[PDB]
Amino acid sequence: XXXXXXXXXXXXXXXXXXXXXXXXXXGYSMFAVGIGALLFGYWSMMKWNRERRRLQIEDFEARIALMPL
Amino acid sequence: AERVAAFLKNVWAKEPVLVASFAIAGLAVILPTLSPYTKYSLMINXXXXXXXXXXXXXXXXXXXXXXXXXXXXXXXXXXX
Numbered sequence: 001x002x003x004x005x006x007x008x009x010x011x012x013x014x015x016x017x018x019x020x021x022x023x024x025x026x027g028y029s030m031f032a033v034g035i036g037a038l039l040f041g042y043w044s045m046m047k048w049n050r051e052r053r054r055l056q057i058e059d060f061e062a063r064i065a066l067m068p069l
Numbered sequence: 070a071e072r073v074a075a076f077l078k079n080v081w082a083k084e085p086v087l088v089a090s091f092a093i094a095g096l097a098v099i100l101p102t103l104s105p106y107t108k109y110s111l112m113i114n115x116x117x118x119x120x121x122x123x124x125x126x127x128x129x130x131x132x133x134x135x136x137x138x139x140x141x142x143x144x145x146x147x148x149x
Binding site: 050053054060 | 078113116117118119121124148
């Protein structure tokens, strides 16, 4: 009996298949989150600066109140 | 349109970042004039004193009282 190297292909490994595809981001939907984070960013920040004004006037009031200084 | 519709999609295709350089900087001039919110910010800037307030001699004066809390002058209380 002769024994040589046997042939096997099975699945053929798929000859040239695309793996690159669009994922997560679509296009217009990313701008809704992108610019949406900006509008949420300013509104949250400016409310803190209005709360800073409560401290600001109260800080300068200490100088006016102190005349024996 | 000859310049509105034609020179818009070409600007988004060729040199797309130059669209943002005119739109964001352009609206930065338009917004502080038309929107009714800028007038409030000017008042708080002037109301907050940098130095100690000066006292004037009382001789027939309106809307001026003692240092204690009373209805006198302007005194800002805009938005809480």
